Amino acid sequence: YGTRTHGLFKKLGIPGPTPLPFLGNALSFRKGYWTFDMECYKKYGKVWGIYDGQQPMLAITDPDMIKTVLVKECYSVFTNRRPFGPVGFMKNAISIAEDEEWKRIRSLLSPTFTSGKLKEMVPIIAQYGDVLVRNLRREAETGKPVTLKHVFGAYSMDVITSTSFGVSIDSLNNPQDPFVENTKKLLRFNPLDPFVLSIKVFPFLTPILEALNITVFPREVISFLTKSVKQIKEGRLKETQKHRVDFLQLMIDSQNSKDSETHKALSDLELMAQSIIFIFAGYETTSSVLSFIIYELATHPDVQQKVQKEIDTVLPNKAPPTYDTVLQLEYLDMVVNETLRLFPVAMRLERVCKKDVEINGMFIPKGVVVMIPSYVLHHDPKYWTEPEKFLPERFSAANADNIDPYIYTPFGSGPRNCIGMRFALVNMKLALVRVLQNFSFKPCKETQIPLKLRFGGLLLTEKPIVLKAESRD
Ligand code: HEM
Ligand SMILES: C[C@]12CC[C@H](OS(=O)(=O)O)CC1=CC[C@@H]1[C@@H]2CC[C@]2(C)C(=O)CC[C@@H]12
Ligand SMILES: C[C@]12CC[C@H](OS(=O)(=O)O)CC1=CC[C@@H]1[C@@H]2CC[C@]2(C)C(=O)CC[C@@H]12
């Protein structure tokens, strides 16, 4: 079994590194997905193939092929992400459901993710900006370098947990709160657990374990959150009077009243899957991107200044940020967009080939995972002049046509792209405005001079990011 599918690419004429029995190329990943992909591209070129366990993955880099995979042949061939072992009911989570199941869950969640529903929700999020400034002021007034991830992670979990589960929390000033402890326990599951790496090697074990309700997610944590959420929904029915606008409230409203009577409404179970998956998807991505943004700003003090000026122009005298004012921070959007070009935390987009296909003159067999190396295409001199430089003007209104949405894909693209993109961008800007309104960041002795990535599911750093924050007056 261990060296079965390993002659697949060589029969297809596709270059790639030579796999090992059982593990495929998995070991060569431990240097970092961003590095491995880069190396393969310079060596094998336009297209290469690799093996993760027994799973063949065909990395492609032509935008025309990428566009075909992510948009046109999305519903028909390239609809699903890889499985990663025995889930349980989490099969209903939007990012794990497949095919039609997925197409319905996405359709049901789309109303809950409208921009107008996002604008309604911002004022509940603002309060967690109050807390970020507190947490940061306490660390900074000590004249002791700040660990970005300490406070931004606190902000990330604070927002995403609160709004997904309907309860306010403060993971830093109240970690005893069972929701903080339990959610942290949940967010410790990650695709690089040994149990997953072993299921990746022997995928045929999954059916059996799902026959035995042996799931890859924490059994007990999820039983807690589920009951804790149940009580919320019910203690929420009795208090008619109050109008909630968090993610929980919009998904309950969607349960009653069927718009688009094509689909049956969400069950209570499917609804838990969404709230849990929102956190997995929102927590660490946001925490990382905010950290990388502050870092870029610290090592580019003139950019930091332009951001601060625009903030002060659009929000005079530390005016509180709102949905409609965040929407005016044109230069801040460019800063964010440029930080995601250098630091696409996902690193890769992945899609499963449902059937034999030929796309843009290339045959792809059923069962292969088409992989788009977003990190590679983001740093490619072929599409980006001077690509390792932070230059937010790249994303100016004037260079809009110079930007291919199938090269730059920090939120993926197409029908299965990040459903929370707009939320993530608003939320990150609420944080950035509140922080930069009060503080400025500069390097310190500790700050790791050029930044160094580390192996992980997301883009992580070797050493944490330490900066000093100096109060503004
Ligand atoms: C900076 C923050 C974030 C980044 C960089 C990010 C990035 C991504 C990427 C690259 C994908 C894959 C898209 C594809 O394969 O084409 C994705 C999927 C997804 N994201 Fe995020 N994300 C962020 C925040 C969030 C937040 C806050 C939420 C929820 C509120 C969220 C919810 C989702 C969901 C549900 C999916 C799965 C979509 C599906 O399978 O239908 N993300 N995200
Ligand atoms: C996983 C392994 C051993 C490695 C074989 O790979 S192979 O190249 O020797 O065919 C495939 C394989 C198949 C079934 C697996 C076996 C390992 C022992 C297993 C898991 C049990 O207790 C019951 C099922 C057995
Ligand atoms: C894990 C599962 C079946 C699912 C049960 O969950 S439950 O909600 O039905 O109680 C818990 C559970 C308990 C004992 C577990 C069993 C799976 C099979 C196990 C692991 C063995 O070979 C010996 C111990 C057995």
UniProtKB/Swiss-Prot annotation:
Keyword terms, alphabetized: Endoplasmic reticulum, Heme, Iron, Lipid biosynthesis, Lipid metabolism, Membrane, Metal-binding, Microsome, Monooxygenase, Oxidoreductase, Steroid biosynthesis
Cofactor needs: heme
Entries under CDD domains matching the protein: CYP3A
Catalysed reactions, semicolon-separated: an organic molecule + reduced [NADPH--hemoprotein reductase] + O2 = an alcohol + oxidized [NADPH--hemoprotein reductase] + H2O + H(+); 3beta-hydroxyandrost-5-en-17-one + reduced [NADPH--hemoprotein reductase] + O2 = 3beta,16alpha-dihydroxy-androst-5-en-17-one + oxidized [NADPH--hemoprotein reductase] + H2O + H(+); dehydroepiandrosterone 3-sulfate + reduced [NADPH--hemoprotein reductase] + O2 = 16alpha-hydroxydehydroepiandrosterone 3-sulfate + oxidized [NADPH--hemoprotein reductase] + H2O + H(+); testosterone + reduced [NADPH--hemoprotein reductase] + O2 = 6beta,17beta-dihydroxyandrost-4-en-3-one + oxidized [NADPH--hemoprotein reductase] + H2O + H(+)
UniProt GO MF annotations: all-trans retinoic acid 18-hydroxylase activity; estrogen 16-alpha-hydroxylase activity; estrogen 2-hydroxylase activity; heme binding; iron ion binding; monooxygenase activity; oxygen binding; retinoic acid 4-hydroxylase activity
GO CC annotations, alphabetized: endoplasmic reticulum membrane
Pathway: Steroid hormone biosynthesis; Cofactor metabolism; retinol metabolism
Phenotype when changing H150D: Increases catalytic activity
GO terms classed as biological process: estrogen metabolic process; lipid hydroxylation; oxidative demethylation; retinoic acid metabolic process; retinol metabolic process; steroid biosynthetic process; steroid metabolic process; xenobiotic metabolic process
Topology versus the membrane: Peripheral membrane protein
Tissue specificity remark: Expressed in fetal liver (at protein level).
Phenotypic consequence of N92S: Has no effect on catalytic activity
Protein name: Cytochrome P450 3A7
Gene encoding the protein: CYP3A7
